[PDB]
Design a protein around this ligand. Structure first.
Ligand SMILES: Nc1ncnc2c1ncn2[C@@H]1O[C@H](COP(=O)(O)OP(=O)(O)O)[C@@H](O)[C@H]1O
Ligand SMILES: Nc1ncnc2c1ncn2[C@@H]1O[C@H](COP(=O)(O)OP(=O)(O)O)[C@@H](O)[C@H]1O
Ligand SMILES: Nc1ncnc2c1ncn2[C@@H]1O[C@H](COP(=O)(O)OP(=O)(O)O)[C@@H](O)[C@H]1O
Ligand SMILES: Nc1ncnc2c1ncn2[C@@H]1O[C@H](COP(=O)(O)OP(=O)(O)O)[C@@H](O)[C@H]1O
Ligand code: NA
Ligand code: NA
Ligand code: NA
Ligand code: NA
Ligand SMILES: [Zn+2]
Ligand SMILES: [Zn+2]
Lengths: 429, 430
């Protein structure tokens, strides 16, 4: 009566003892690759009909940070796919209102989305998969689900996922992550894989008649084609966990007729503003472009570094939440300023380099900080505590650079380590 | 009995990468295991600073710079590294009377030029730099402890000598662990000075045994022991130093702590030869680092060393013969970065098609496969020649892909970042 989860075997895998909050187990579990040190990762992308806002930035920056930790810090090999939903009810509606083609609208806002991601120093994925370029593959994917008897065709030419038939199989469970969230249909919970199109909507040919992909089928199709029958990581905001992500699991399990398409499903918490999710529907949003006319990429990234990725966060506007971010950014700027100059202007001809007790004490705190930050990253990507550890180290380095005769090589190594962590955070100084 | 034993560190609680390194203590490739956690305490012998450094010195310090970058940047070990400067030496004393400037001023001039040459070659400074002239008091205390443990004796002239026979007698000590077969005021001719009674007109320091100078080897045991302690994860130097210098360091340090294993992994770089002979100040066959740098770049010089396994000897053919290949490789890397940055800059998201094609998948497969080949090369005793070849082959295929295929912008960026990562590990700058 309750979904089971199979932890990957550790034999032959890279083992870091990283633990992650897995929505499939609703618990922190040890992260174990399916193969070697490889991570196949699919993340749901935006629906490109309007500008992106600070809530979208929170999800994509948080998972950018996680990806940098996985790759730059732990040395996993990440193969990442992000889709672009450039066919959608919202795009169609917006495009008639503005009297422009569906493709021209979608391409503009896809362009602005990637520009906003680049402005926030978010890395592009390995592959970008647009629905409009995968419609043929989606049709073939649906044909296989029908052939496995997990979907049916209505008279109008739609295709619906057959929840009851899927559940019946002992190898399949429907709504693995939110079990409790559950006329032409067998049962009302059945969802469309293929929607019969009105003659005035954009549409594509199919064995069942002119139509469009359903809301969820594109993500199973694209991830399955490129990454295959087992994903190490699948990610998105928490609102997508059900119906969207649970439905992806059902579609993909039905396609491959197996029991676990995704090993680790990661859900970022929502950014709220004045207690409510930042949302285009609520008209309480701040565009990323507007945010960047007031704050820098570094300051915005610090905002997200200070909030655990899988917890919700409150954003207080009019600069309230950003006060701390600006202070931290300023302290990092001034630290780098001093250490860079002290290194550049250091004179080996006239210095004394005896390794003193003050040098030893700073070095001990330095190596200790490396170990604290390691534990924070293993603890479900705990960037708030890792950032605080960096701040504490910087406080002591600043004292050391002011009074003690300075060990040039120790400061260079410290600068390189803090640079390494800031690269992992996505900060640029 | 009659053969030195070696104790591999326990793996429990340690970072385990399956890295194997050529250990001179075992004369074999053995798995590298830290003494503690992911930490590596590393001492490397430094230059004697009386004249300019040459290309042979560059090979040793660049090779161990590459190894350090692999350990830290690639494997994420935590390296605490110490390098000494021998600024008191018979050669410095003699050279300073010739040059008629104080011995301190001469030594500091050539130490400064050594570090400038290292920076020009993108060699990272160590955590600590230990000059003999700043450690004489500690050296005296170190010798006092060795005498107190009865492993050294004082001659009437005021010199102190290490007592090889007394040291060997102990069942926990073996003399010449790494080159066992290389073995009037002294008990036995193999005894070596820890403290030298001072000659007239030489610089000198006070001690309980009279005015003198450190012996040839005692500074490295003293400095490493003071900063790093009673067990070093790595000790390094050129192969010529393995005996007597490094074996004598082991004996001094074991005598000070009265234990059996001061160094877990002893790594020796091979010599750079020129026309069949070690590049050497004595043979007057040397090329200074500065003269090399007026003809070639840091990248080209580092590629020269990347092409030769760090612990094997290499031949250097002068007049540009060995550098022809290095210049070609450096040019192909410069050109690769030019091309890929142009393709990225000129990529247009509004007119492109981003379907993940068969050509995209084949390049990605080669990309991930290259990551695993390079991983195995680094685990195989820092095999940079084969790692560099793997990067060259990947670049050849990326160049083909950028010329004809519609390009996956994100895939090209990710590949560029990985090659950047490996090039940072090599010390190359593009
Ligand atoms: N940095 C890395 N690059 C490429 N592959 C890696 C890396 N780290 C680990 N692996 C791969 O992970 C697998 C197991 O990791 P490892 O820590 O070596 O455990 P094992 O003791 O099983 O070899 C191996 O197939 C290895 O190639
Ligand atoms: N306020 C918010 N806070 C955090 N993440 C959000 C917020 N709003 C949307 N997201 C996330 O941003 C991503 C893109 O959302 P959106 O552009 O609305 O398209 P869709 O959610 O339909 O894929 C999704 O993972 C979504 O969960
Ligand atoms: N990148 C790193 N930074 C700091 N410490 C590390 C790092 N990698 C490993 N360690 C430390 O090295 C030791 C080896 O841990 P590991 O073998 O990964 O897991 P386990 O603790 O099960 O042995 C641990 O004490 C760990 O704290
Ligand atoms: N031709 C050479 N090739 C490689 N390494 C060399 C060469 N000549 C000297 N070295 C190494 O350079 C380092 C510095 O040597 P040197 O300046 O002579 O002082 P010392 O021998 O006291 O270290 C040593 O590790 C030595 O083995
Ligand atoms: Na079932
Ligand atoms: Na939901
Ligand atoms: Na003995
Ligand atoms: Na020798
Ligand atoms: Zn999706
Ligand atoms: Zn030495």
């Amino acid at each position: 009566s309750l979904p089971k989860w199979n932890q990957p075997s550790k034999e032959g895998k890279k083992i870091t003892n990283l633990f992650v909050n897995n929505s499939l187990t609703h618990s922190k579990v040890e992260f174990i690759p399916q193969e070697g040190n490889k991570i196949k990762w699919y993340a749901c992308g935006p629906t490109v009909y309007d500008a992106a806002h600070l809530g979208h930035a929170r999800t994509y920056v948080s998972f950018d940070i996680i990806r940098r930790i996985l790759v730059n810090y732990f040395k996993y090999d990440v193969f990442m796919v992000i889709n672009i939903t450039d066919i959608d009810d919202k795009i169609i509606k917006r495009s008639v209102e503005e009297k422009i083609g569906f493709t021209e609208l979608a391409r503009k806002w896809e362009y602005e989305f990637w520009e906003d991601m680049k402005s926030l120093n978010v890395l592009l994925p390995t592959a970008i998969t647009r629905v409009s370029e995968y419609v043929g593959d989606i049709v073939k994917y649906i044909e296989k689900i029908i052939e496995n008897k997990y979907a049916y065709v209505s008279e109008e030419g739609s295709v619906y996922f057959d929840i009851d038939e899927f559940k019946k199989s002992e190898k399949h469970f429907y709504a693995r992550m939110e079990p409790l969230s559950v006329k032409k249909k067998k049962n009302a919970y059945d969802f469309a894989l293929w929607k019969s199109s009105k003659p005035n909507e954009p549409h594509w040919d199919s064995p069942w008649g002119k139509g469009r992909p359903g809301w969820h089928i594109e993500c199973s199709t694209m991830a399955s084609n490129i990454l295959g029958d087992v994903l190490d990581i699948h990610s998105g905001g928490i609102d997508l966990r059900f119906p969207h992500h649970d439905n992806e699991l059902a579609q993909s399990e039905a396609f491959f007729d197996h029991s676990q398409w995704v090993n680790y499903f990661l859900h970022s918490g929502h950014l709220h503003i004045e207690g409510l999710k930042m949302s285009k529907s609520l008209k309480n949003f701040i565009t990323i472009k507007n945010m960047l006319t007031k704050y820098t990429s570094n300051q915005i990234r610090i905002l997200f570094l200070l909030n655990k990725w899988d917890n919700f966060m409150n954003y207080s506007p009019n600069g309230e939440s950003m006060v701390q971010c600006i202070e931290i950014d300023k302290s990092f700027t001034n630290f780098f300023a001093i250490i860079l100059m002290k290194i550049k202007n250091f004179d080996l001809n006239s210095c004394n380099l005896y390794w003193s007790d003050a040098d030893n004490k700073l070095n001990l705190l330095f190596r200790q900080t490396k170990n604290k930050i390691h534990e924070h990253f293993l603890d479900n990507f705990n960037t708030p505590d890792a950032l605080l550890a960096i701040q504490k180290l910087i406080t002591e380095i600043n004292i050391y650079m002011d009074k003690e005769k300075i060990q040039i090589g120790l400061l260079l190594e410290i600068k390189h380590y803090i640079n390494f962590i800031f690269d992992t955070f996505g900060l640029i100084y």
